[PDB]
Design a protein around this motif. Sequence first.
Motif: not given
Lengths: 60, 50
Positions: A3, A7, A10-11, A14-15, A18, B43-44, B46-48, B50
């Motif tokens: 996880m 994550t 994911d950050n 996602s950046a 975008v 934080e996971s 909110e990352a999802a 985002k």
Amino acid sequence: EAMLAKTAADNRKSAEQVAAAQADYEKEMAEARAQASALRDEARAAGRSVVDEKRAQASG
Amino acid sequence: MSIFIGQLIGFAVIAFIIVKWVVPPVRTLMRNQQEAVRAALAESAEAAKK
């Protein structure tokens, strides 16, 4: 652990994604603009050819 | 009985020492771990989002 790693990924993704979407928008805009400019250029070239042809015929 | 009273008093002293000087840091460590994992979960989430 998966996880947290997912994550962080994911950050990051996602950046960058975008940014990639914005760049793709600009790329599509540029491609469409170039297509429009090419249409206008060839149209005016054809017009110039037509006017030259008909002027030459009138002179003859 | 007398030795029972002595060992009961000794256990009372031990428990006092534990609660005074051992329970606080251990509770702090448990709360720290719980807060860290809770923050990781949030934080996971909110990352999802985002």
